Amino acid sequence: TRDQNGTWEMESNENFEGWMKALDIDFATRKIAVRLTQTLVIDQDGDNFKVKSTSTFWNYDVDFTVGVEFDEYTKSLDNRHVKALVTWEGDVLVCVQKGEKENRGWKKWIEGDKLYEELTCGDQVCRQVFKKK
Numbered sequence: 001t002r003d004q005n006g007t008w009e010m011e012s013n014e015n016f017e018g019w020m021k022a023l024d025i026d027f028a029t030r031k032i033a034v035r036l037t038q039t040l041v042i043d044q045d046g047d048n049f050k051v052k053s054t055s056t057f058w059n060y061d062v063d064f065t066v067g068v069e070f071d072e073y074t075k076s077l078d079n080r081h082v083k084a085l086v087t088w089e090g091d092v093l094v095c096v097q098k099g100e101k102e103n104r105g106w107k108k109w110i111e112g113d114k115l116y117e118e119l120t121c122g123d124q125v126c127r128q129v130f131k132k133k
């Protein structure tokens with residue numbers, strides 16, 4: 001399924017700190033953020049997505065249209081400018097963020113009642129699993 005609508009509560013997080021270090025997030029922020037359970041809220045209608053990543057420590061929101069390139073400031077993550085594009089590879093939703101960092105972006109897909117996420121930067125991959133609330 002390509003339908004990723006829902007409120008998604010984190011059940012597994014792997015190598016989150018490696019991904020953050022690859023983005024040059026400072027020590028203090030990394031040490032707090034790695035501890036935390038995350039929530040992902042996805043509103044999806046056709047190509048139009050609104051995504052919100054949250055914890056007790058951050059709120060990171062982005063809106064995009066599948067297949068439409070958009071310029072992006074990564075705001076409270078690593079404050080960088082990137083050229084972003086989200087597309088489908090089968091039923092994997094793939095984001096490529098072109099800029100200073102190589103291999104930067106993410107992939108999301110549904111397995112049953114769970115959402116699987118890869119966050120990539122450089123040679124680091126963070127793997128996450130969320131359960132549909």
Ligand SMILES: *C/C=C(\C)c1ccc(-c2ccc(N3CCC3)cc2)s1
Pocket residue numbers: 029033051053058059060062076077106
């Ligand atoms: C599709 C998933 C996305 C866009 C994200 C998943 C985790 C994100 C995120 C955003 C900000 C932060 N930080 C602020 C200090 C740490 C961590 C993770 S976005």
